[PDB]
Amino acid sequence: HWGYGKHNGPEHWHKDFPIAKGERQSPVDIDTHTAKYDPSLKPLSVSYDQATSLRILNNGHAFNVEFDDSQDKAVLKGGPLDGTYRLIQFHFHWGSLDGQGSEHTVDKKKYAAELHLVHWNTKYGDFGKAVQQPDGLAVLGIFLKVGSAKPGLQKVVDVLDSIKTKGKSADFTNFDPRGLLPESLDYWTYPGSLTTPALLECVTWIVLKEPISVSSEQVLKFRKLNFNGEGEPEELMVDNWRPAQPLKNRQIKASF
Ligand SMILES: [Hg+2]
Ligand SMILES: [Zn+2]
Numbered sequence: 001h002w003g004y005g006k007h008n009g010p011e012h013w014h015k016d017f018p019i020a021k022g023e024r025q026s027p028v029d030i031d032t033h034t035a036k037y038d039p040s041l042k043p044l045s046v047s048y049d050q051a052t053s054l055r056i057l058n059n060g061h062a063f064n065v066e067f068d069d070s071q072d073k074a075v076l077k078g079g080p081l082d083g084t085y086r087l088i089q090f091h092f093h094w095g096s097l098d099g100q101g102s103e104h105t106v107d108k109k110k111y112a113a114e115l116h117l118v119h120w121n122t123k124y125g126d127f128g129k130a131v132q133q134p135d136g137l138a139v140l141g142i143f144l145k146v147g148s149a150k151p152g153l154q155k156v157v158d159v160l161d162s163i164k165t166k167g168k169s170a171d172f173t174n175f176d177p178r179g180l181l182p183e184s185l186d187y188w189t190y191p192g193s194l195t196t197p198a199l200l201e202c203v204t205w206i207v208l209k210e211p212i213s214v215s216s217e218q219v220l221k222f223r224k225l226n227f228n229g230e231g232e233p234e235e236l237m238v239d240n241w242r243p244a245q246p247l248k249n250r251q252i253k254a255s256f
Contacts, residue, residue: 024201025245026192027103038253044185045078053175060166062091080189085119085138094222096238103241111143136202149215152179157221165230182210186256195242
């Protein structure tokens with residue numbers, strides 16, 4: 001199957017997943033001078049105070065932190081969205097070096113990593129249903145740059161040792177996502193897709209202007225994860241990002 005290697009990387013995904021060369025693929029390059037300032041755009045509403053983290057798992061391509069989405073516990077609303085979207089999981093994409101790792105680019109600038117908080121539209125009842133609609137998902141993307149340590153990320157970092165290989169999971173309760181948000185909620189938004197197979201075109205992307213800073217030690221720890229399963233040859237989990245895709249007519253609107 002698919003990966004980020006020489007023989008199964010992004011350039012090969014189209015073979016199993018034809019939609020890889022569809023009309024609304026992600027990520028893209030955000031050209032700040034071409035983005036349209038839209039004054040009709042409402043402020044984002046992030047309601048994560050009653051979030052319920054359950055666990056963390058190494059799925060062989062990233063590590064997912066999962067949340068209880070059986071009720072409106074952690075939700076996203078406002079901004080470009082109509083209705084309420086529930087948080088289901090967050091994950092990151094990171095590089096082998098500090099100069100790469102992000103999926104979206106800003107004026108061709110690459111960040112060290114990118115945080116994706118994934119939410120599904122409650123009018124669809126379940127995640128599986130929401131991935132059948134063009135307005136099924138909303139992904140909140142936050143860039144990471146190397147500098148000062150992010151206190152709020154430390155809890156995730158310390159548990160990576162326990163889920164080093166593909167298929168390993170750990171109980172991960174009482175984790176507050178609010179510690180991973182930047183000061184400002186200014187954003188760019190555009191209609192896209194999931195950045196991993198099945199590359200479904202169901203996402204409303206909200207990418208935050210303001211990056212969060214994390215320390216070299218913190219991102220270092222991400223780089224120690226393995227794509228492989230226990231008892232298998234070691235393949236470091238690095239560079240698990242997809243290159244920018246053709247914008248193809250779409251328009252990127254700015255909230256600022
Ligand atoms: Hg869809
Ligand atoms: Zn992602």
